Design an enzyme around this catalytic site. Structure first.
Site, short mmCIF file in Angstrom:
data_model
loop_
_atom_site.label_atom_id
_atom_site.label_comp_id
_atom_site.label_asym_id
_atom_site.label_seq_id
_atom_site.Cartn_x
_atom_site.Cartn_y
_atom_site.Cartn_z
N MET A 193 -11.71 -7.20 -5.50
CA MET A 193 -11.70 -8.55 -4.93
C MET A 193 -10.63 -9.35 -5.66
SD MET A 193 -15.62 -9.66 -3.63
CE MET A 193 -16.37 -8.41 -2.56
N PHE A 200 -11.27 6.01 -6.94
CA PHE A 200 -11.47 6.77 -5.73
C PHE A 200 -10.58 6.23 -4.62
CE2 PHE A 200 -13.27 7.74 -1.70
CZ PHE A 200 -13.63 9.04 -1.81
N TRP A 201 -9.87 7.15 -3.96
CA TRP A 201 -8.98 6.80 -2.85
C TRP A 201 -9.07 7.98 -1.88
CZ3 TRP A 201 -2.86 6.54 -2.96
CH2 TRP A 201 -2.41 5.88 -1.79
N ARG A 219 -27.47 -15.23 -1.03
CA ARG A 219 -27.20 -15.88 0.26
C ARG A 219 -28.48 -16.49 0.80
NH1 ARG A 219 -24.83 -10.75 0.32
NH2 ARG A 219 -24.12 -10.83 2.50
N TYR A 223 0.87 -1.17 0.00
CA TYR A 223 0.00 0.00 0.00
C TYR A 223 0.91 1.23 0.00
CZ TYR A 223 -4.16 2.65 1.76
OH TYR A 223 -5.16 3.56 2.04
N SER A 255 -21.27 -4.48 2.09
CA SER A 255 -20.02 -4.03 2.68
C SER A 255 -20.31 -2.81 3.55
CB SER A 255 -19.01 -3.67 1.58
OG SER A 255 -19.49 -2.53 0.79
N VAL A 273 -18.99 0.23 3.38
CA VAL A 273 -19.22 1.40 2.52
C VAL A 273 -20.55 1.32 1.79
CG1 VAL A 273 -18.41 2.63 0.49
CG2 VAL A 273 -16.78 2.08 2.35
#
Lengths: 364, 364
Positions: A277, A299-300, A202, A57, A178, A180
């Protein structure tokens, strides 16, 4: 004098192999005028914290000898909630008892205490202060400790890039269950945006769908439905009936799922990729770029809020206020309390190994 | 009266099954004031032309009975060079002998003649005019017939999106041996941009490489080299030694090739996808979007220039000047001359069947 513990490493690698605990001193009788001492209340384990330790990272704290080690060592953790213990003679922005988060990434939050400058921190209202301000809720420790990555990510992706017309326009997202994704559904409801959440099928599907719809997703579909040519007219009708357009896709999955959500956008669509993923690239048909004026970007939150204090502040203020006003809810963390019987780094190593159970919060 | 021939179809399908040649008459001596009669000099066969006939292209001419058919039938071809043979009483922008191209798509260029308005055409200088005005070269028929798509596509992708610093900055493209690729290399040389061309390997690789470098590619690499992790350092060093950055990727392939060129951009890179290699989606690692501020977008010359006549004019004028000055070269077409002894549609059907030989230009 305060004796503190910090989780450190001298070399990148897997947390189970490279983490250790370092005892260090903080002189609370010798604070410089703008310095403050804080004591940690809680700090979570996020994928980014683990990837940072792993060496994959590209935003990380420098290894230093600051903790008194024999070799340069880096601390761990980027988000956390702390309580202010003592402030220097020139500090007016903070006082003892205040809640704070780090003002910047790479602070190192997997530790018991920290000495910094008053501007290394951002004040959050603690529960007594929210109460005295007449608010119906105060923040929990988990809310405070996870406020700075996931909620800001959801908010910014929804507001900073394409302007959706309230009451009309749509976003679509995968990873709908998730952290987010769940914030995005809630914020979408608050902003009056329509949304489709795409999730994995699921066994308790009906219950998960009802739960996401209560959070604020307008519609919820599975990845099989996202992939299905024959289910596809249902989605076009939803958007047609609303009078708006699907303008924005949020991708954290890649591969076929990214393809499926991209294809649901109207012309002039924007995809933002904020996660992935493993070894599953973002895969978009050529025709969408050429014939539908489709754009895919990244996006970060770390990079975006680098050198943008005002944008960070104002987004943070809204998320705080929404917790206080009972308009946003967090997913519950699994909490492990540090009482000093087991080395701190081991609580975090266990948390890393137990990541599939749910969000791990180490508390103090 | 003029007796003309057009290549038509009443039903979408493969050109070898659906094309036929229709005779029709153009009222020579009865032009409305603004009307124009042109004779075709040459029209190429482009992939998009074939795709329109197949019915899988989103921009197509209307089926009408105006060619004198019994069912609705659509013409073929979007690109072509015509010569004005007669003009109506109010036409001042054009005269007999003038070279022109269609101003819009869907004109139907696979025919011997056409009737339009003066504003359905854009004037190009004919060789007599270029010569009389002191220019060292005039346009060839192939140059004129193929000016409207590929040269403008290369010029616009290179100059309209990102500003490359002369001498320093880089673009990278796949399909380096494509018509657009070879224009981009030349335009790169003319504007002092550095470039890497990725091409498929072939039995005569060294000759192809020498030829692309003469056109203006700074470096030429194979798709194998594009896929090599171990080659990354060489590319990084090429870019470092120039003092610039790789800011722009042009993709017409998709799949692994698109991944490869994307990975070679510096931070803040832009990819434009203007073509695709049949069911090979654009495939981009998640990490580029998140950590390298990468953007992937589309390019479609038809859409970009729809309502930007001034951008179209200015671009075209540059390509025209470069041809007259001898600074730009076309790839040589295989030419089949229509002389009446073989049905026109059969010349086009043969051209479609012989696409792998090279660009096919039917001349008149």
């Amino acid at each position: 004098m305060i004796t503190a513990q910090a989780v450190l490493y001298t070399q990148h690698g897997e947390p189970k192999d490279v983490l250790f605990t370092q005892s260090f001193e903080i002189d609370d009788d010798n604070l410089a005028p703008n310095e403050v001492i804080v004591k940690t209340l809680g700090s979570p384990i996020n994928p980014s914290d683990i990837n940072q330790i792993q060496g994959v990272y590209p935003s990380k704290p420098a290894k230093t000898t600051g903790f008194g080690t024999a070799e340069p060592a880096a601390p761990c953790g980027n988000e956390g909630l702390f309580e202010v213990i003592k402030v220097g003679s020139n500090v007016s922005s903070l006082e003892a008892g205040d809640w704070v988060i780090p003002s910047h990434v790479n602070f190192g939050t997997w530790r018991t205490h920290a000495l910094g400058n008053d501007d290394d921190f951002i004040k959050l209202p603690n529960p007594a202060q929210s109460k005295a301000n007449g608010k119906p809720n105060g923040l929990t420790i988990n809310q405070g400790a996870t406020i700075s990555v996931n909620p800001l990510t959801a908010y910014l992706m929804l507001t900073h890039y394409v302007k959706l017309t309230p009451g009309k326009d749509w976003f679509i997202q995968n990873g709908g269950t998730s952290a987010v994704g769940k914030y995005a559904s809630q914020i979408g409801k608050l902003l009056n945006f329509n949304s489709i959440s795409v999730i994995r099928d699921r066994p308790n599907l009906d219950e998960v769908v009802a739960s996401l719809k209560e959070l604020g997703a307008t519609q919820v579909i599975t990845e099989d439905q996202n992939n299905s040519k024959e289910f596809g007219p249902t989605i076009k009708e939803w958007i047609k009936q609303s009078g708006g357009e699907a303008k924005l896709a949020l991708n954290c999955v890649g591969g076929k799922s990214s393809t499926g959500i991209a294809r649901k956008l109207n012309n002039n669509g924007l995809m933002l990729t904020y996660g992935g993923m493993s070894f599953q690239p973002v895969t978009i048909p050529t025709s969408l770029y050429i014939f539908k004026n489709f754009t895919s970007a990244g996006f970060w939150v770390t990079e975006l809020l680098k050198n943008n204090k005002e944008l960070k502040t104002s987004t943070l203020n809204q998320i705080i206020a929404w917790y206080e006003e009972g308009k946003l809810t967090d997913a519950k963390s699994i909490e492990t309390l540090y009482d000093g019987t087991k080395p701190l780094h081991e609580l975090y190593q266990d948390g890393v190994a137990n990541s599939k159970d749910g969000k791990q919060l180490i508390t103090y």
